[PDB]
Scaffold this motif. Structure first.
Motif, PDB file in Angstrom:
ATOM      1  N   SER A  32       0.832  -1.194   0.000  1.00 56.87           N
ATOM      2  CA  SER A  32       0.000   0.000   0.000  1.00 56.87           C
ATOM      3  C   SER A  32       0.872   1.251   0.000  1.00 56.87           C
ATOM      4  O   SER A  32       1.817   1.360   0.785  1.00 56.87           O
ATOM      5  N   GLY A  33       0.550   2.189  -0.883  1.00 53.85           N
ATOM      6  CA  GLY A  33       1.273   3.447  -0.960  1.00 53.85           C
ATOM      7  C   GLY A  33       2.713   3.335  -1.410  1.00 53.85           C
ATOM      8  O   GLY A  33       3.583   4.025  -0.863  1.00 53.85           O
ATOM      9  N   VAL A  34       2.989   2.496  -2.405  1.00 49.91           N
ATOM     10  CA  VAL A  34       4.352   2.297  -2.885  1.00 49.91           C
ATOM     11  C   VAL A  34       4.610   3.161  -4.112  1.00 49.91           C
ATOM     12  O   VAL A  34       5.757   3.519  -4.398  1.00 49.91           O
ATOM     13  N   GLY A  35       3.554   3.505  -4.844  1.00 47.66           N
ATOM     14  CA  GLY A  35       3.713   4.332  -6.024  1.00 47.66           C
ATOM     15  C   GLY A  35       3.180   3.724  -7.307  1.00 47.66           C
ATOM     16  O   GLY A  35       3.656   4.055  -8.394  1.00 47.66           O
ATOM     17  N   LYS A  36       2.194   2.832  -7.192  1.00 49.64           N
ATOM     18  CA  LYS A  36       1.648   2.173  -8.375  1.00 49.64           C
ATOM     19  C   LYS A  36       0.996   3.172  -9.323  1.00 49.64           C
ATOM     20  O   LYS A  36       1.143   3.062 -10.547  1.00 49.64           O
ATOM     21  N   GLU A  37       0.265   4.148  -8.782  1.00 54.52           N
ATOM     22  CA  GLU A  37      -0.307   5.196  -9.624  1.00 54.52           C
ATOM     23  C   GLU A  37       0.789   5.999 -10.311  1.00 54.52           C
ATOM     24  O   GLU A  37       0.664   6.361 -11.490  1.00 54.52           O
ATOM     25  N   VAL A  38       1.872   6.282  -9.586  1.00 50.53           N
ATOM     26  CA  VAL A  38       3.008   6.987 -10.170  1.00 50.53           C
ATOM     27  C   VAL A  38       3.583   6.189 -11.332  1.00 50.53           C
ATOM     28  O   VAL A  38       3.867   6.738 -12.401  1.00 50.53           O
ATOM     29  N   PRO A 182      15.793  11.554   0.707  1.00 46.89           N
ATOM     30  CA  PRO A 182      15.404  12.452  -0.395  1.00 46.89           C
ATOM     31  C   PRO A 182      13.902  12.633  -0.526  1.00 46.89           C
ATOM     32  O   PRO A 182      13.456  13.685  -1.001  1.00 46.89           O
ATOM     33  N   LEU A 183      13.106  11.639  -0.127  1.00 50.78           N
ATOM     34  CA  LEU A 183      11.656  11.792  -0.180  1.00 50.78           C
ATOM     35  C   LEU A 183      11.172  12.812   0.844  1.00 50.78           C
ATOM     36  O   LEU A 183      10.393  13.714   0.513  1.00 50.78           O
ATOM     37  N   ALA A 184      11.630  12.688   2.092  1.00 51.99           N
ATOM     38  CA  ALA A 184      11.163  13.581   3.149  1.00 51.99           C
ATOM     39  C   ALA A 184      11.481  15.034   2.823  1.00 51.99           C
ATOM     40  O   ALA A 184      10.605  15.904   2.892  1.00 51.99           O
ATOM     41  N   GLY A 217       2.429   2.248   5.938  1.00 55.92           N
ATOM     42  CA  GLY A 217       1.777   2.943   4.853  1.00 55.92           C
ATOM     43  C   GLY A 217       2.707   3.367   3.744  1.00 55.92           C
ATOM     44  O   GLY A 217       2.258   3.974   2.767  1.00 55.92           O
ATOM     45  N   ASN A 218       3.996   3.064   3.877  1.00 61.24           N
ATOM     46  CA  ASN A 218       5.025   3.333   2.863  1.00 61.24           C
ATOM     47  C   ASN A 218       5.071   4.840   2.614  1.00 61.24           C
ATOM     48  O   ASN A 218       5.169   5.609   3.583  1.00 61.24           O
ATOM     49  N   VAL A 219       5.013   5.302   1.364  1.00 64.22           N
ATOM     50  CA  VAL A 219       5.238   6.716   1.073  1.00 64.22           C
ATOM     51  C   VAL A 219       4.094   7.583   1.586  1.00 64.22           C
ATOM     52  O   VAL A 219       4.318   8.722   2.011  1.00 64.22           O
ATOM     53  N   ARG A 220       2.857   7.081   1.543  1.00 64.95           N
ATOM     54  CA  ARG A 220       1.726   7.887   1.996  1.00 64.95           C
ATOM     55  C   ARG A 220       1.816   8.187   3.487  1.00 64.95           C
ATOM     56  O   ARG A 220       1.510   9.304   3.922  1.00 64.95           O
ATOM     57  N   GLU A 221       2.225   7.202   4.290  1.00 61.80           N
ATOM     58  CA  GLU A 221       2.383   7.437   5.721  1.00 61.80           C
ATOM     59  C   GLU A 221       3.485   8.454   5.994  1.00 61.80           C
ATOM     60  O   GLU A 221       3.346   9.303   6.881  1.00 61.80           O
ATOM     61  N   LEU A 222       4.587   8.382   5.246  1.00 62.93           N
ATOM     62  CA  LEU A 222       5.645   9.377   5.391  1.00 62.93           C
ATOM     63  C   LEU A 222       5.145  10.767   5.020  1.00 62.93           C
ATOM     64  O   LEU A 222       5.471  11.752   5.692  1.00 62.93           O
TER      65      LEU A 222
END
Ligand SMILES: Nc1ncnc2c1ncn2[C@@H]1O[C@H](COP(=O)(O)OP(=O)(O)OP(=O)(O)O)[C@@H](O)[C@H]1O
Ligand SMILES: [Mg+2]
Length: 247
Positions: A32-38, A182-184, A217-222
DNA sequence: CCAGAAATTGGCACGAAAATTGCAATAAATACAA
């Protein structure tokens, strides 16, 4: 702009570059929230048909009783109350891309109906006589374990084999530690301008704390954590104590 | 004249085509109320 600074992510990006010009259905699996839409929108953008519609659909939002009417369309007088003829989503994305989010919510009859069209490539309206040919590129994304679904008896095996020609499995954020920092810093800026709060970066202790949390939550939780930190702060630096309660 | 041979007829069969019958309630234009 997106962030791809992990060797697995760079390899996936090279795979996207290789595949984006092909003509086969793509299946995107991950947590969940890994970037599939991206990944789906990046596949569509780096494509020869990037100027064509990208019809994103949620298969759980379509009722069963009218399912095949929405996906294919109906003619005038097909059923009682049919005021006028209407097209389906397959014709709407003709020449473009059709993205199906959370493909694991489909029912068996819907799976067979979709399999027929994916195989033959041509369909008929609900109350139509002529046959319609389309040129739709199909992307489907899901977070379930599709192998367990087919073993249990919930997903058609032939449909999975047809769709599962190409598999793109985005690794979890906990396996992408060199991609966390780099994401944060990417998010901290974006909210800082958005909410007008003044903040520059994270202290060393906060950065150490970020790499140790096993994100679920992977990227969404961050993103949510960074948004909370930006909202509930006024200083120029975010320290350990601000994120300690959130974590 | 006779008996074998040839011709005639209609019953049954077979695939195809034509005729008969079951279904029983909707769709659209129009005039009126806020
Ligand atoms: N490389 C990236 N850079 C910046 N933001 C990213 C990146 N990858 C993902 N995101 C962000 O992650 C968020 C969630 O990602 P996404 O929409 O792809 O979820 P998902 O994997 O489809 O989720 P779900 O499985 O729950 O349906 C998005 O808001 C997106 O902006
Ligand atoms: Mg999604």
């Amino acid at each position: 702009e997106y962030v791809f600074e992990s060797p697995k992510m760079k390899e996936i990006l090279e795979k996207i570059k290789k595949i984006s010009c092909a003509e086969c259905p793509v299946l995107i699996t991950g947590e969940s929230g890994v970037g599939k839409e991206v990944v789906a929108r990046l596949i569509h953008k780096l494509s020869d048909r990037s100027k064509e519609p990208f019809v994103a659909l949620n298969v759980a939002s379509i009722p069963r009783d009218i399912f095949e009417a929405e996906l294919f369309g109906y003619e005038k007088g097909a059923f009682t109350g049919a005021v006028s003829s209407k097209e389906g989503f397959f014709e709407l994305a003709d020449g473009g891309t059709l993205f199906l989010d959370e493909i694991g919510e489909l029912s068996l009859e819907a799976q067979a109906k979709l399999l027929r069209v994916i195989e033959s490539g041509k369909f008929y309206r609900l109350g139509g006589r002529k046959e319609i040919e389309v040129n739709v590129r199909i992307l489907a994304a899901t977070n379930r374990n599709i192998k367990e679904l087919v073993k249990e008896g919930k997903f058609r095996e032939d449909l999975y084999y047809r769709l599962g020609v190409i598999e793109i499995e985005i690794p979890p954020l906990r396996e992408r530690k060199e991609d966390i920092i780099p994401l944060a810093n990417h998010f901290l800026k974006k909210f800082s301008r958005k909410y007008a709060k003044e903040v520059e970066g994270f202290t060393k202790s906060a950065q150490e704390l970020l790499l140790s949390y096993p994100w679920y939550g992977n990227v969404r939780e961050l993103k949510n954590v960074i948004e909370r930190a930006v909202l509930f702060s006024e200083g120029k630096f975010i320290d350990r104590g601000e994120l300690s309660c959130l974590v």
